[PDB]
Amino acid sequence: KVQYECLTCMANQCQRIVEMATQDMDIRRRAMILAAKLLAKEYNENAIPAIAGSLIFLELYKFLGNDDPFIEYKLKSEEMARKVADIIKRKLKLDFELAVKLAIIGNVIDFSVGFSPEDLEEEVEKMLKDKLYIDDSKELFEEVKRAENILYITDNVGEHYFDAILIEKIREISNAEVYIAGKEGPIINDATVEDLKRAGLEKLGKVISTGTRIVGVPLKLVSREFMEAFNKADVIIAKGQGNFETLSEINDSRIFFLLKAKCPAVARELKVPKGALVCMRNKFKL
Amino acid sequence: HMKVQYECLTCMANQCQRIVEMATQDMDIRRRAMILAAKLLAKEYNENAIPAIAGSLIFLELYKFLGNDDPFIEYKLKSEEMARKVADIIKRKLKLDFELAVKLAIIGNVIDFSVGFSPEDLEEEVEKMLKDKLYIDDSKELFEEVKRAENILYITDNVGEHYFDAILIEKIREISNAEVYIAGKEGPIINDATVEDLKRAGLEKLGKVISTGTRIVGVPLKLVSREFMEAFNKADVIIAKGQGNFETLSEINDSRIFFLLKAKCPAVARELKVPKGALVCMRNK
Secondary structure, rough: OOOOHHHHHHHHHHHHHHHOOOOOOOOHHHHHHHHHHHHHHOOOOOOHHHHHHHHHHHHHHHHOOOOOOOHHHHHHHHHHHHHHHHHHHHOOOOOHHHHHHHHHHHOOOHHOEEEEEEHHHHHHHHHHHOOOOEEOOOOOOHHHHHHEEEEEEEOEEEHHHHHHHHHHHHHHOOOOEEEEEOOOOOOOOOOOOHHHOOHHHHHHEEEEEEOOOOOOOOOOOOOOHHHHHHHOOOEEEEEEEEHHHHHOOOOHHHOOOEEEEEHHHHHHHHOEEEEEOEEEEEOOOO | XOOOOHHHHHHHHHHHHHHHHHHHHEEEEEHHHHHHHHHHHHHHHHOOOOOHHHHHHHHHHHHHHHHHHOOOOOHHHHHHHHHHHHHHHHHHOOOOOOOHHHHHHHHHHHOOOOOOOHHHHHHHHHHHHOOOOOEEEHHHHHHHHHHHOOOOEEEEOOHHHHHHHHHHHHHHHOOOEEEEEEEEOOOOOOEOOEEHHHHHOOHHOOOOEEOOOOOOOOOOOOOOHHHHHHHHOOOOOEEEEHHHHHHHHHHOOOOOOOOEOOOHHHHHHHHHOOOOOOOOEOOOO
């Protein structure tokens, strides 16, 4: 279902949107009054939070007159993450196990507020010593080696430069063609196809759109082109909580979820402690 | 009233969530309660909202939905026990003038009495805090108004705090011939002191304990009892504890009112025109 924590989670994101979009306190108030009404409309027993939330966020974008409140935050994260990834490529020679861990850690770091790329890279080195709570990385390793087609479904900007490192490793060990999916247009901090393209990811695989400005992969809304890639994939790597929430409904063992279980609802869905790092194949557990 | 601020929606939502968590571990009941909370938020979070009132009305509906007249009861019992004990130490150790007794009442607004197990350690921290200067201190004006009052109304806030309030009320009784009316809530709402709480702290020995007539935080001037309104009118000085009392009373042009609070939330700080977290004894201007 929807979980009880989802209301505050969505409201908090709404608040972050209005804060990014304007400094005018009157506009912020009016935006949040609208948000309350939209939350009440969308937050019900049948709701899928990635989709419900996203539709609320996009209506607020319209109310605020700003089609992408996060443009600056995203540019800041990209610039930092690019430099951090460059130091990592220089200082570390990651094996596959640690590349997977690095991809997950990329989901965790706030690249927009760091001191320096070196300071952040040192934090990353410490986090690379953390143990995955669920760890199907060895199975991912085997599957990618035998794959002819791999779909990589991204999450946030910043993170995508760590994803690129994992994708480089995949190309070192597999002959598969890699498809790399981003969003059609901006939604919160998520990477769009133009963000992926601007980062040079077309050097690593074919960049494709999900067809939506919705978080995750809303299977009834995504494009026909996305589905063709989805259906042909031998292996599907899905980054972050939204992709998990939208893809964990379905029975499909090709999918590996790489995320941090930041929200208690997701931690409870996964049956892990809050904050756990996870590489988990989409199979029945218990 | 006081214009609602954009950050008040998450504040209220968060409080709703803390209520459902405290009331039950059943995840399906929690979900259904937060689904209701969303509807109530859309109803009450509007251009006319005063957060103390709007929030309280939402919280009371959640109490009803949950079948729990007071989800905070175990916290409150813990806070009352700790506060009573700390206040007894204070009363044995310290001689306090009026200024310090005012600061103490404000400090009581600051402390979470539900945490920890050492009255000595907490009382030591209270003694530390008494040496700090209030950001705004109108307690000399208060002192003189109190000495001259024929009637005083003291409007409480939270349980725990009300044991510190009792120390200030005792000091008031020493230096004034005013009849003191002491107002609490009709029934439980969050951690606020009710009429029964005030009576259990022995406050009927010091003044007339009365109800606001509501289970709403602060003083909702359209909803309070005729008895409370009569006490409010009769007062020559009104002492109002905490943010909620401030939010609801800041609308009126009435120099009888002195606010004793910490500006814990940024909306209140912004309205008071003081730094976040500032401790004040401030006459309504």
